[PDB]
Paper text:
Self-splicing protein introns (inteins) are genetic elements that are translated with their host proteins. After translation, the inteins catalyze their own excision and re-ligation of flanking protein regions (called exteins) with a peptide bond, resulting in active mature host proteins. There is a class of inteins lacking the HEN domain, so-called mini-inteins.
We solved the three-dimensional structure of the PhoPol-II intein at a 1.48-Å resolution by molecular replacement. In line with the loop minimization often observed for proteins from thermophiles, we could trace the electron densities for all of the 168 residues without detecting any flexible linker sequences, which were present in the structure of the PabPol-II intein. The largest difference between the two inteins lies in the flexible 19-residue sequence at the HEN insertion site for the PabPol-II intein, which is likely to be a remnant of HEN degradation during evolution. The distance between His154 and the carbonyl group of Q166 is 3.4 Å, which is shorter than the distance (4.6 Å) between the corresponding atoms of His160 in block F and the last residue, Asn172, in the PhoRadA intein structure.
Numbering used by the authors: -1 to 166
Write the structure that this text describes.
Amino acid sequence: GNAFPGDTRILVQINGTPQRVTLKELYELFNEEHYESMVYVRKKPKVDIKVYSFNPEEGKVVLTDIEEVIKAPATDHLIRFELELGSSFETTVDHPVLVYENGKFVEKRAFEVREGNIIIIIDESTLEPLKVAVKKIEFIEPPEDFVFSLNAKKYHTVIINENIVTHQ
Ligand SMILES: [Zn+2]
């Protein structure tokens, strides 16, 4: 399954306040827990929480509900993307990643992303999108026993680490 490392940060709105939490912390803000089909799923929120998403049909940041958070055993390698200006993120090898090409978001599996592909970051104050190139790609042996994901209602995009737009 597709996932992120637990130390990945995600932009959320908690009780009306925007902030970043790690995916591990996000998982802990839910209860409930059920273990089934080798994964742990939590659906009931402990705080009033929404996730910030990017709506590609309108080019706009939007808020949406979190349907569930998931913790799964780590199996595959991760891929780390280092971006122009020094930001970075990591996903499992087949995780969808959004790159910006010729005026649209292309959804590629992480292992198909190439150096020089463009990633979109958001300026949080103006909500303006900015383009940064992928500068380096690394394959990383899984470094923790569990990885984490979430399902965001409708848009299925999230804003991670240093304001990076990607697919949930
Ligand atoms: Zn849905």
